[PDB]
Every structure is written in C-alpha cells, then in structure tokens.
Amino acid sequence: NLYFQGMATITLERDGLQLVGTREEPFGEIYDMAIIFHGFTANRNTSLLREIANSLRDENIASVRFDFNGHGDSDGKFENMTVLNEIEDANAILNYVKTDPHVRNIYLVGHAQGGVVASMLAGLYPDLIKKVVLLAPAATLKGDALEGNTQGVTYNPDHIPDRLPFKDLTLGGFYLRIAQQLPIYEVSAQFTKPVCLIHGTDDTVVSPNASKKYDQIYQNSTLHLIEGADHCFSDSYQKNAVNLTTDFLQN
Amino acid sequence: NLYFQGMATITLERDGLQLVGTREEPFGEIYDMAIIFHGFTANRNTSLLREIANSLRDENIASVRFDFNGHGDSDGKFENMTVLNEIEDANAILNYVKTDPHVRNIYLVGHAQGGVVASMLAGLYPDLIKKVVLLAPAATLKGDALEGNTQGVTYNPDHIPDRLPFKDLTLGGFYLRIAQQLPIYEVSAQFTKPVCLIHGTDDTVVSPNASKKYDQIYQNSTLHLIEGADHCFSDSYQKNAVNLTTDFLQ
Numbered sequence: 001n002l003y004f005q006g007m008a009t010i011t012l013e014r015d016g017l018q019l020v021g022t023r024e025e026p027f028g029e030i031y032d033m034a035i036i037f038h039g040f041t042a043n044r045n046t047s048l049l050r051e052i053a054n055s056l057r058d059e060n061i062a063s064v065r066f067d068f069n070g071h072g073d074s075d076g077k078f079e080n081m082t083v084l085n086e087i088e089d090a091n092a093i094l095n096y097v098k099t100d101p102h103v104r105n106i107y108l109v110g111h112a113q114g115g116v117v118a119s120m121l122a123g124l125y126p127d128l129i130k131k132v133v134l135l136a137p138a139a140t141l142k143g144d145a146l147e148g149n150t151q152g153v154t155y156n157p158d159h160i161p162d163r164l165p166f167k168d169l170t171l172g173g174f175y176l177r178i179a180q181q182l183p184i185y186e187v188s189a190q191f192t193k194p195v196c197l198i199h200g201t202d203d204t205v206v207s208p209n210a211s212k213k214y215d216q217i218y219q220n221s222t223l224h225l226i227e228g229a230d231h232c233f234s235d236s237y238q239k240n241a242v243n244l245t246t247d248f249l250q251n
Numbered sequence: 252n253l254y255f256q257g258m259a260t261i262t263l264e265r266d267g268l269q270l271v272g273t274r275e276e277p278f279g280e281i282y283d284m285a286i287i288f289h290g291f292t293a294n295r296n297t298s299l300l301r302e303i304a305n306s307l308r309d310e311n312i313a314s315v316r317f318d319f320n321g322h323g324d325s326d327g328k329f330e331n332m333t334v335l336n337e338i339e340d341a342n343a344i345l346n347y348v349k350t351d352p353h354v355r356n357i358y359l360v361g362h363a364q365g366g367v368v369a370s371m372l373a374g375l376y377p378d379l380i381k382k383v384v385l386l387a388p389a390a391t392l393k394g395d396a397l398e399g400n401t402q403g404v405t406y407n408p409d410h411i412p413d414r415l416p417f418k419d420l421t422l423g424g425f426y427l428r429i430a431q432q433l434p435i436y437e438v439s440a441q442f443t444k445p446v447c448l449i450h451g452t453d454d455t456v457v458s459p460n461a462s463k464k465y466d467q468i469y470q471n472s473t474l475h476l477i478e479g480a481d482h483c484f485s486d487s488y489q490k491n492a493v494n495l496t497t498d499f500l501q
C-alpha cells in the first residue's frame with residue numbers, strides 16, 4: 001500500500017485446516033491482485049510461481065499464493081486432498097482477497113491442477129474475477145481418471161481402491177472418484193471475460209490438447225503454445241511463461 | 252453386534268472438523284447398515300430420522316446418522332456449508348461404515364437436501380452402495396438458486412452476495428454459487444442399483460417433480476407419491492414414509 005511494500009506470510013482457515021500463503025504487497029493505495037495456484041504435489045514457492053509473483057509485483061500488481069491442503073506448509077494429509085477441496089481452499093483465499101479494501105481487480109493464475117482450480121473457481125465467480133491465466137491447466141486429470149491411468153499409475157476406473165500408492169505418496173480413492181465426474185469445462189465455460197492460456201508443446205504430463213480445448217470453450221480467450229516447453233516451464237522456458245502472464249495481466 | 256445393542260454417540264473428523272453422529276446397533280454378528288442424511292437447517296435427531304433409524308434397528312439393520320458441518324452438534328459455521336462439503340462429510344462417514352467388519356450391505360437414506368447428498372454420493376460409489384432411499388430429495392435447490400429465490404429468501408442469481416441472512420442463520424454466497432451448477436442428476440444417474448423415491452404430493456418446499464425427475468433418470472427406481480403428505484412427512488404420513496423405507500431396505 002502507500003506505506004508498506006514487500007512479503008508477508010499469511011495464514012487462513014478453511015474447514016478447520018490452516019492454509020499457509022505468501023502475500024506480495026506493491027506500492028499504491030489501490031492495486032490489482034492475483035491469486036496464484038500451484039499444481040498436484042507442488043507448493044506455493046516453486047521457481048515458476050515465485051517468479052510470477054515477483055514479476056507482477058514489479059508492475060505493482062499484488063499477489064497471494066497458498067499451499068493447498070495436503071501440500072507444502074498447509075494442514076491436512078495429501079491422501080485427503082481432492083480437486084474439490086482445493087476449490088474450497090481457493091474460495092477461502094478468494095474470501096480474504098475480495099474483502100481487502102486496496103484491491104481493485106482480482107485475477108486468477110493457475111499452473112496445471114492449479115489451473116483446473118482457477119478455471120472452475122472463475123466459472124463460479126464470473127461476476128467477480130476480471131482475468132484468468134491458465135498455465136498447462138491439467139483438465140486431462142478427468143479423462144486420465146476415467147481411463148484408470150494417472151501419471152502412469154494404473155487402477156480399475158470402475159473399482160477405484162480406497163487409496164492408491166502413488167510414486168512416493170498415497171493418492172486418495174476419493175480424489176480419483178471426484179476427478180472422473182468433475183464438470184471442469186461445464187463450470188469453467190461460464191467465465192466469459194479474458195483468459196490467457198499458456199501451454200508447452202512438449203508437455204508430457206498434460207497434453208497441450210487441454211489448452212486447445214479450453215481455447216474452444218472460452219468466449220474470450222488467447223492461446224499461447226510455447227514451442228519445446230515442458231510441463232513446468234523450466235529454466236530456459238520460464239521467462240516466456242512469466243512474461244506472457246504479466247503482460248496479459250498488466251493490460 | 253452379538254454383545255452390545257442400542258445407541259451410541261460416535262465422532263468422526265473430516266478435514267479439521269468434528270462430525271457428531273448417533274449409531275443404532277442391532278443384534279447379530281453381521282448386518283446391513285444405512286447411513287441417514289438430514290436436510291438443510293435440520294439435524295440428525297428430527298422425528299422422521301429418529302423413527303427411520305429405530306424402525307431399521309427393529310429389523311436388525313444398523314444405522315448411523317450424523318449432523319452435517321454447520322448443523323446440530325457438528326463443527327463449522329452454517330455460513331460455510333455447501334452441498335459440496337456435505338458430500339465430503341458423507342464420504343468421511345462412508346469411510347467409517349465401509350471399514351466396519353460387521354457391515355454387509357451399505358444403504359443410503361437421505362431426506363431433502365440430505366437426499367441430494369445421498370444420490371450424489373451413491374453416483375460416486377455405485378460399486379459400493381447397495382440401495383438408496385430418497386425422501387423428498389431437494390434437487391430443486393439448483394433451479395431455485397438459478398431463479399434467485401431460496402425458500403423465499405431472494406437475490407440476483409447473477410450477483411450473488413458474499414452472505415445472505417436467512418431466517419435466524421447466515422447462508423453463504425458460495426452455497427448458492429455451488430447450487431446453480433451442481434451436477435445433481437449427472438452424478439446421481441451413475442447409480443444403477445435399486446432406488447426408492449418417496450415424495451409427498453402436498454410438499455410445498457420441494458416440488459414432487461424433483462422425485463419424478465429422479466424416477467426418469469434412474470435405471471432402477473420405484474416412485475411413491477404419498478397423497479396429502481408435506482415436506483417433512485408430518486403426522487400420519489411419517490409412519491407411512493418410515494415403513495416404505497424399512498420395507499425397501501428389508
């Protein structure tokens with residue numbers, strides 16, 4: 001604001017769980033603010049998200065970025081996380097943001113599963129959210145769950161087990177049952193304001209077809225396919241992802 | 252079980268919320284179990300729900316009935332409840348029931364908004380749930396939120412407030428935003444096993460069309476329109492709804 005600028009650690013509560021986040025506070029009495037959502041098994045302080053936050057703050061756009069339940073410093077077991085309760089975390093964070101008296105426009109920015117959170121939350125709040133940036137939004141998680149193959153880990157999609165050993169973690173059965181019937185595009189499509197879609201052509205984790213589909217369903221969207229980029233927009237690709245995001249939002 | 256019969260309080264956690272419930276425990280080493288779900292602003296111990304649980308227990312069908320988040324004895328503010336986090340409560344109850352070694356078949360019984368929770372939970376667990384009874388299930392909560400009128404409380408459906416005073420309570424705006432796009436019939440239709448639909452013809456809170464619609468969508472449903480019954484199946488209609496429910500579950 002006019003008096004304080006910089007970082008602070010913030011904590012919110014959703015259904016008895018603490019959510020830990022980082023706020024970047026820019027100059028000025030009034031400013032826009034982005035809520036930035038990390039992906040599946042990630043956290044709020046990946047290099048991509050730290051750099052999005054930094055780049056937006058460089059343009060006087062505030063941001064908050066939280067660890068979802070079951071991730072980073074936030075409460076709850078990973079086994080108990082679903083995309084639905086991450087949407088609930090997102091709405092709790094939105095509650096905090098929309099009552100801040102300095103905030104003018106609210107933007108959502110999401111990477112991967114965090115992009116599914118953002119897109120569905122924007123379709124639930126199409127009157128309140130002003131712009132959305134989706135980075136490699138993992139809408140394919142639904143089809144993957146219907147097919148019985150999530151990130152190479154297989155199971156009967158009609159007899160989902162109670163819990164699924166999942167690389168080094170344990171993925172909840174309820175995560176997969178929710179994922180199969182999540183109305184991702186049905187809800188997301190109700191957001192008719194501007195959307196920026198950014199997806200690496202060499203993403204082997206979420207097919208770039210997810211972004212080509214969101215681009216079809218959205219009334220006012222712009223698709224940026226990034227030649228050769230990977231799922232995480234890492235290294236030599238990170239700046240372009242951060243640049244497109246910031247430009248879209250600074251307009 | 253073979254040694255204890257009767258009522259007990261049970262508590263479960265869902266996220267960081269405690270849910271408080273009542274278990275009705277019948278005779279016998281193995282038995283079927285109904286999970287019973289109350290409606291909007293109700294609690295686990297309404298007359299109707301108590302009578303259903305007792306009637307099942309007399310037929311050696313166990314049951315549990317919990318207060319949803321933001322209701323009765325359970326944790327959380329009412330303002331923060333939605334049908335979505337009720338399905339999350341119902342799933343935490345299902346986790347408890349499905350790991351009990353005495354339980355044979357699992358049934359869901361839901362009244363009004365508890366009926367939408369039951370029908371959606373059964374469409375998420377169509378492999379596990381064996382039968383579902385819905386009493387006046389409130390699927391019309393969706394159309395009502397799209398219309399901008401929830402039990403006579405009004406708002407612009409395209410400009411839903413942050414919160415809405417509602418009788419002596421505070422309803423959350425997110426409840427309403429959820430309601431408008433809730434895929435009630437899409438998810439519910441995945442359950443292809445037997446469903447009993449019980450709806451009173453003089454229900455003024457939830458149109459009987461709600462249960463006629465479920466009857467169309469379900470592969471295997473039986474529809475009971477009880478002539479003269481109101482939303483709560485009050486007075487003489489209560490035993491009629493209870494006996495249909497018990498008979499169907501067996």
Ligand SMILES: O=C(O)/C=C/c1ccc(O)c(O)c1
Nearest residue numbers: 039040112113138141144150
């Ligand atoms: O957030 C990510 O980085 C990846 C998410 C993702 C991608 C594919 C799936 O099947 C799934 O459950 C989650």
Ligand SMILES: O=C(O)/C=C/c1ccc(O)c(O)c1
Nearest residue numbers: 290291363364389392395401
């Ligand atoms: O549970 C009940 O007894 C009634 C539920 C109900 C009925 C109509 C609505 O619009 C609504 O949000 C909830």
Ligand SMILES: [Cl-]
Nearest residue numbers: 001002003029
């Ligand atoms: Cl100021």
Ligand SMILES: [Cl-]
Nearest residue numbers: 045046047048
């Ligand atoms: Cl990193």
Ligand SMILES: [Cl-]
Nearest residue numbers: 037066067068
């Ligand atoms: Cl988050």
Ligand SMILES: [Cl-]
Nearest residue numbers: 140141143144
């Ligand atoms: Cl897929």
Ligand SMILES: [Cl-]
Nearest residue numbers: 203204230231
């Ligand atoms: Cl990749």
Ligand SMILES: [Cl-]
Nearest residue numbers: 189191218219
């Ligand atoms: Cl749209």
Ligand SMILES: [Cl-]
Nearest residue numbers: 215216218221
């Ligand atoms: Cl488009």
Ligand SMILES: [Cl-]
Nearest residue numbers: 256257258259
């Ligand atoms: Cl007793």
Ligand SMILES: [Cl-]
Nearest residue numbers: 252253254280
């Ligand atoms: Cl026993």
Ligand SMILES: [Cl-]
Nearest residue numbers: 296297298299
């Ligand atoms: Cl009562």
Ligand SMILES: [Cl-]
Nearest residue numbers: 330331423426
């Ligand atoms: Cl709410």
Ligand SMILES: [Cl-]
Nearest residue numbers: 412413424425
């Ligand atoms: Cl709200």
Ligand SMILES: [Cl-]
Nearest residue numbers: 091095423425
């Ligand atoms: Cl809210």
Ligand SMILES: [Cl-]
Nearest residue numbers: 436437438440
């Ligand atoms: Cl469907």
